[PDB]
Amino acid sequence: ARGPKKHLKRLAAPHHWLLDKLSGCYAPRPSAGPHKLRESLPLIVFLRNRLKYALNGREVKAILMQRHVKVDGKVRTDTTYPAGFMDVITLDATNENFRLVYDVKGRFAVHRITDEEASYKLGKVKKVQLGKKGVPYVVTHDGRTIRYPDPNIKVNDTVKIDLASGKITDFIKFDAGKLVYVTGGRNLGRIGTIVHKERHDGGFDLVHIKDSLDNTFVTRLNNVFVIGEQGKPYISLPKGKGIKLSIAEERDRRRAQQ
Amino acid sequence: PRAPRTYSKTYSTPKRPYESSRLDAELKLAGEFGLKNKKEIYRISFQLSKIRRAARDLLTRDEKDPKRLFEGNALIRRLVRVGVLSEDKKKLDYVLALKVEDFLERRLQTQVYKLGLAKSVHHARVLITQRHIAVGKQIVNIPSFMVRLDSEKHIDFAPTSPFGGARPGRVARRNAARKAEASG
RNA sequence: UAUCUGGUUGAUCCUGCCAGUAGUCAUAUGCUUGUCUCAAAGAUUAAGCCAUGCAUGUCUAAGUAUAAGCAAUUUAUACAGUGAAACUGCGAAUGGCUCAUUAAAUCAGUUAUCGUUUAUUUGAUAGUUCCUUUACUACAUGGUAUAACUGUGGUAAUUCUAGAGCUAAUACAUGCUUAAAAUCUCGACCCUUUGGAAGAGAUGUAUUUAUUAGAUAAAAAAUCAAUGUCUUCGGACUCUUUGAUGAUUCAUAAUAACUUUUCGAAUCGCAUGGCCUUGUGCUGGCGAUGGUUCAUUCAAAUUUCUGCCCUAUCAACUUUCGAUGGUAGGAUAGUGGCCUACCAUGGUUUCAACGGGUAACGGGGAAUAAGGGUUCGAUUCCGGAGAGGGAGCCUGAGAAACGGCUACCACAUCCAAGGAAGGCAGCAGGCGCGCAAAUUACCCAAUCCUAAUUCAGGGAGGUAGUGACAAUAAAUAACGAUACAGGGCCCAUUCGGGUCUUGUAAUUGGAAUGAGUACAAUGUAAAUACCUUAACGAGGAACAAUUGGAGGGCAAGUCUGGUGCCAGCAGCCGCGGUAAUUCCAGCUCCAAUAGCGUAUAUUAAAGUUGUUGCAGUUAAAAAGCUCGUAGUUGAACUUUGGGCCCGGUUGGCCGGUCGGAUUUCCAACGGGGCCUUUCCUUCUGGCUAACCUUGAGCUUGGCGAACCAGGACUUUUACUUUGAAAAAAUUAGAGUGUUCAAAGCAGGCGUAUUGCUCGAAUAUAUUAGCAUGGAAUAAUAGAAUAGGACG
RNA sequence: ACCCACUCGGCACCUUACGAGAAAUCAAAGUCUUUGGGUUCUGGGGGGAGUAUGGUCGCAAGGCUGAAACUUAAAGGAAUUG
RNA sequence: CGCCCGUCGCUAGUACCGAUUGAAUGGCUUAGUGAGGCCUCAGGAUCUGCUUAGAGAAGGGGGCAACUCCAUCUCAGAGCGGAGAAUUUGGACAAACUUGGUCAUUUAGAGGAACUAAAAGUCGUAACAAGGUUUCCGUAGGUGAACCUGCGGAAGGAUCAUU
RNA sequence: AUGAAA
RNA sequence: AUCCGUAACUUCGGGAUAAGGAUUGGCUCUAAGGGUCGGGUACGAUCAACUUAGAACUGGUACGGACAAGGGGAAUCUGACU
């Protein structure tokens, strides 16, 4: 329509934000950023509909403007900034550090963690290229573009970063038999320990993946997210660890935790 | 632009209107359970028909069909929680068989009459709508309740109305003022 | 919840239709209407015309402020506080409204950009700017207005504007200031000739062109054009380095130039910090702004396969002057007939082209159903189109903008007649159109958006009003005793009681709150409403429930009066011609109930559209008969067989758990593998594998896929299985006490001070597209005057 | 040329009624609600109407294709008794 | 004494033909005129930088007397340039209008010929029985009307039957 | 040869 | 004159130059279209004609420049025609 969009209704906003179909017929549009539109969590929906630390966007703007908040080691004083996958946020108040990861129910969880677990993150390499003047570089899944990494670091690998700079703490390559995390599809939030893969040269590299209950499935190689090696995750993981039990098994779980 | 509020009925009219058998049976039911509306009767029959369709198209399925297991167990759970069904009949065939009479006796008005706070189901109706009642610690003025049996244990008259004390009555104060004026 | 009924006959069976019947977020209307909650609403006829008034403006600490504006700096002599107007920068291309257009077009799924732009954000990113490069030039920094304002003013009118005088910049036009090496040229000079050379210009970024590199199946030999490395000048010759890609003239690097010359900070707020070579020397922080390139993100435009309603009373269509292709060029941001020059003459078609029509925008979806299905879908979400019809274009990253300009066309307004300004299919509202459709209201409190920005604005939006469109709940009345009539039981002492019945009642009494009034608080931006509860508020005359109908289908009068085939009723049948069970009234009675009917459209019914699943002798219907193209359909056969093992599911002993779970399990059930003439691609490899490899009972060495890169033959499909993916809302459905319910997605639990805590599942997702195990079924070419395979 | 028996193909026939059909009736008018061998053509209540128009063929007569408006609850088939 | 056909006559409706070179509406459109912007050839009001440019003669510095050095208000004059509107050639884009053609959608109409409907209209009595000439099909002719006649065909015939 | 309407 | 387009009606032959529109000069060029002679037991040389098409440049948009040289359409009556 004659130019960029600026508005966003509810019911075009994604499902997993869990925004309610009442309460005004307009929704918070994620302004552009280092993450996409849909696999992103605005800070407004975060603060206003995950913690209830505020009730209204006016209050949230007060918060963002008084700068209790900071992402990537930076204040990021916008009410609708994309808090994407894996991302880190640090709050002086309560001295908390929340991390933005997924749950198996297909939602952005709220992973309470410490300042060092915030001070490092994870990032999937999106691609690698050679910039001008012969500077090899790569770019991640969070719009971060980084220069002079190891040549051993290639595509589909994952990096662990300092968060005071965009430099590397370490890296993990992609190969058969490594612990991963899923981003896309019915498997949103699974953790399923690569068992093998398949090429289909021409499009849609596919991967057969199963979690420790033997339970297997198949996913796209650009929807997966490698988090390190089998056993140790490089971070702390949320309730469930990407399992997707049955409706009845979860019913029994909660009925035990009545 | 505001997404429109869903609405959907809770009843269904008779396919064929004038069947004397149908009319007399449902009149018996209305005149015993203290009802005003074939609307209400159709409504309860419609709920029963929905659950019965579910029962049919579930027992169509094999055993250990996890859909059958989950949904049938939840159906059992709500039926025992509401009390139309027993605490020992979970085999789904009693569910095929259950009755509008069962629903009606689990309603509040005739329950009130059985408990004896009415002297007539119609007396229960007028007491309900005049708020001389509360099933828990909050007043209710609706006959159609489908009690959950915790209410049954917790029944009492309205605390904030006579027959549970706390006030003599509107016309009670009226009569008292009348006799005060007479003595004056 | 896979249902039928009445009606052609004197009657019967049938076809066959009609009517009845049920429903509709399908509309209109009628009669009526007390309440709580939610809420649609000028689409249909006119995308018809529109008065009036709003609907997009906008600043911080931080671009420019002497407002001859206002407080006071007194920490500040330049201000340094605030601050209209104005310059500037952003945005005004989103929203919102309607559905006129449009029938391979949009659109939906599905691909690509190895064929492109992309403000903004976000991550990274400008030692190279003195150009006779030595005076050609401030870099503790350079030049120019101009607005606002002062005032002169001019028109009847305009967001009309001139004239003269100021002044500012992140507005304009300009502008130097930091390394080191390294090759080319020259080339002084020596001159050598094996040939050695000081000194000088260049090189950042960006554009344009040309060129090179950007890789790499395998091992040795003969030399030299001249040995080239260093020399035993016998020749040892190795050393070599290049990423990604499915795949590129890719990324990227360098030579040689091009540029009318691109970027390389003259910007701004705070805080003021350190060295002394004691100089306003030198260095220093947290920021905002902008800035070249690359990537990213929100986008955008093109694009692959598949798919669209009715029409043959439309069969040929397209190409003059682009139709199909190709070459070269132009344009584009980019490919490309997008356009041109030239050239070949092709391209689509009964597998329905082309043309016409459409009360056609499409889809997500809605009603309705056993299945199959039929119908609708402007209409809250997605994509498209439009701003009265058309055309054009400026600004801009982004428009073919219309709440922006230019014109024409039809409309229409103000004129102090010279001229001037507009396009409600935005919110309200009005005219007209009609069967058919709300207030010229309040608020930004929320949901969001926008700006310089927390602070302002927003008829987007929320709120309230009209509102019987549709949905949820549910009042209008009840209870004791007193005159009758019962049913069991006891007495069976008669027909006495009847204890108790359950009703019948010109019986009577209470208590009993609601509707409406509320004082109030609460509600909400303020409210008005809901809930709360005071105070006031019933015995029916009270506070008064209607709408249809009583012959049938179809439940409900053999009641009264009136009427007399008249008046009138009735969907169908039929009633009425002086005893009307139908008409008009009274009474009574049944149906549904704050709703009920009526008219029209549509689904079920309807196996009266029939793929499932119709009929064709006579009920309508077999072409007069034959040939025949496309089309649909088309005989049988080519691998069976057995053995051998293997391990999974189901039970089945033992339950060795007190109705859970295990073993040898006999058996079945489907699955994997070997052989039976059954190669069921092999060459290079490394794993050499499973290793014949065995060291004394755990040792040193088997045949490449079981990991993988490739070379390789991979004749074609349909089919079928599985998976990724298919935007939400919706639908079905989990849980959930909105007081139930429709709803919604919340809620629940505390030691109620620290607080704790499950949730917001799951399913469905057609064809088509990708991968996908199979190889039955259907065809499908194969080597026959063998250009035949292994060779 | 006859007779007998058999055979393939033809015009048909007698009887049954398993089967079918609404019935008459039928060796297919069967093997169809226990609904599917293959294909073509036609009908969707009665009339209007095989009318009107437009094409098209024919010298013409006329033919092939071929609606609608409007109207209507019946027309019609087969059998029974009268 | 059943049912029933058609003409003719009255009343009402619906559609058809129809002179009218009929009328409108909309779309496509040859040709012609062709605005308006945009691009390109020029244009040149206007403003404006540089380069000199000589002098009417002030000021001071120096032969201190004519005379000499530079600045100066001045004005031509000259080029060296920058931007530059009005206007302007040509081009592609192309609204609107005129005129025809054409495609569909509605529509007026003297009159004519039909159809349908309508409690009791006239003329006959064609049909149903052998319907009183067995009926019907096609074709041709005829006449007030149903209808008759000829040629061939059928049984839905009044016959399933002559060894 | 015909035989009114319900 | 060239190009474009062309109704009803029809005896299917016509109507039809239907109607109705556009263009046309000069100068400089370009393309094609021919005749005859030529090869050891694809092609060259050489000669002269008019046509048709197209493109630049030009002009006080003029140009079949004088002469020459159809007005048409829809219908009636009537005779068929020459």
Swiss-Prot record, chain A:
Protein name from the UniProt record:
Small ribosomal subunit protein eS4A
Family recorded in the similarity comment: Belongs to the eukaryotic ribosomal protein eS4 family.
> Has the keyword Cytoplasm been applied to this entry?
yes
Q: Which GO terms describe its biological process?
A: cytoplasmic translation; translation
Q: Work out whether the entry's keyword set contains rRNA-binding.
A: yes
PANTHER family documented for this protein: 30S/40S RIBOSOMAL PROTEIN S4, SMALL RIBOSOMAL SUBUNIT PROTEIN ES4
Q: Where is this cross-link: Glycyl lysine isopeptide (Lys-Gly) (interchain with G-Cter in ubiquitin)?
A: 61, 133, 160, 167, 173, 178, 210, 232
| PTM annotation (Phosphoserine): residues | 31, 246
Give the subcellular location: Cytoplasm
**Organism name:** Saccharomyces cerevisiae (strain ATCC 204508 / S288c) (Baker's yeast)
What residues bear Phosphothreonine in this entry?
114
Cross-referenced InterPro entries, in alphabetical order?
KOW, Rib_uL2_dom2, Ribosomal_eS4, Ribosomal_eS4_C, Ribosomal_eS4_central_region, Ribosomal_eS4_central_sf, Ribosomal_eS4_KOW, Ribosomal_eS4_N
MF terms in GO: RNA binding; rRNA binding; structural constituent of ribosome
Swiss-Prot record, chain B:
Q: Which residues carry this modification: Phosphoserine?
A: 183
Domain S4 RNA-binding, first and last residues per copy: 106-180
The positions making up the signal sequence are: none
Cross-referenced InterPro entries, in alphabetical order?
A: Ribosomal_uS4, Ribosomal_uS4_CS, Ribosomal_uS4_euk/arc, Ribosomal_uS4_N, S4_RNA-bd, S4_RNA-bd_sf
- The main place the protein resides is cytoplasm
Q: What GO cellular-component annotations does this UniProt entry give? A: 90S preribosome; cytoplasm; cytosol; cytosolic small ribosomal subunit; nucleolus; nucleoplasm; small-subunit processome
> GO terms for molecular function, please?
rRNA binding; structural constituent of ribosome
> Where is the protein localized?
Cytoplasm; Nucleus, Nucleolus
List the PROSITE patterns hit by this protein, alphabetically.
RIBOSOMAL_S4, S4
Q: Which UniProt keywords apply?
A: Cytoplasm, Isopeptide bond, Nucleus, Phosphoprotein, Ribonucleoprotein, Ribosomal protein, Ribosome biogenesis, RNA-binding, rRNA processing, rRNA-binding, Ubl conjugation
For this chain, the site of the Glycyl lysine isopeptide (Lys-Gly) (interchain with G-Cter in ubiquitin) cross-link is 179
Q: Which Gene3D superfamilies match?
A: RNA-binding S4 domain
Region Disordered: list its residue ranges. Answer: 159-184
- Please, one GO biological process term? ribosomal small subunit biogenesis
Q: What's the short name of a Pfam family annotated to this entry?
A: S4
Q: What does the record note on quaternary structure?
A: Component of the small ribosomal subunit (SSU). Mature yeast ribosomes consist of a small (40S) and a large (60S) subunit. The 40S small subunit contains 1 molecule of ribosomal RNA (18S rRNA) and 33 different proteins (encoded by 57 genes). The large 60S subunit contains 3 rRNA molecules (25S, 5.8S and 5S rRNA) and 46 different proteins (encoded by 81 genes). Interacts with snoRNA U3. uS11 interacts with MPP10. Component of the ribosomal small subunit (SSU) processome composed of at least 40 protein subunits and snoRNA U3.
Q: Which family does it belong to?
A: Belongs to the universal ribosomal protein uS4 family.
Q: Which NCBIfam families match?
A: PRK04051.1 (NF003139), uS4_arch (TIGR01018)
Any idea what job this protein has?
A: Component of the ribosome, a large ribonucleoprotein complex responsible for the synthesis of proteins in the cell. The small ribosomal subunit (SSU) binds messenger RNAs (mRNAs) and translates the encoded message by selecting cognate aminoacyl-transfer RNA (tRNA) molecules. The large subunit (LSU) contains the ribosomal catalytic site termed the peptidyl transferase center (PTC), which catalyzes the formation of peptide bonds, thereby polymerizing the amino acids delivered by tRNAs into a polypeptide chain.
The record makes one more remark, namely: Present with 106000 molecules/cell in log phase SD medium.
Family matches, as PANTHER family: 30S 40S RIBOSOMAL PROTEIN, 40S RIBOSOMAL PROTEIN S9
| Record-given protein name | Small ribosomal subunit protein uS4A
Q: Which organism is it from?
A: Saccharomyces cerevisiae (strain ATCC 204508 / S288c)
**Gene name, please?**
RPS9A
